[PDB]
Amino acid sequence: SMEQVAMELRLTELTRLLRSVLDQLQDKDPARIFAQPVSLKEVPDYLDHIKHPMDFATMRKRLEAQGYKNLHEFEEDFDLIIDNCMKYNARDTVFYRAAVRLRDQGGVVLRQARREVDSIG
Secondary structure (H helix, E strand, O other): OHHHHHHHHHHHHHHHHHHHHHHHHHHOOOOOOOOOOOOOOOOOOHHHHOOOOOOHHHHHHHHHOOOOOOHHHHHHHHHHHHHHHHHHOOOOOHHHHHHHHHHHHHHHHHHHHHHHHHHOO
16 A cells, blocks of 8 residues: 555654664764673673663664664663663673763763654654
């Protein structure tokens, strides 16, 4: 149907916007602490601590399959990246501190992304 096609075009356009948001968020992590999944070879107990792991590579895979239906879904995944790190790692670690900086800096980007997703429908 033409309606299905139109809905597909909206999903595609959202996907393009989310790809730029994701690039911008990832630049706020120049150390690449959140680039890849936590390794179960190197943190074998990780899943006893953290139930829903998340990282930028896993977000990127989801995005390229047009797997985010809306910005809320994408923000949930970004928040897991930050929130997992701040529970697993102590306050006085380079990891926790990197999460805090990513949160603070990413908040700016997400604030305007919310306006762009509303604005352009």
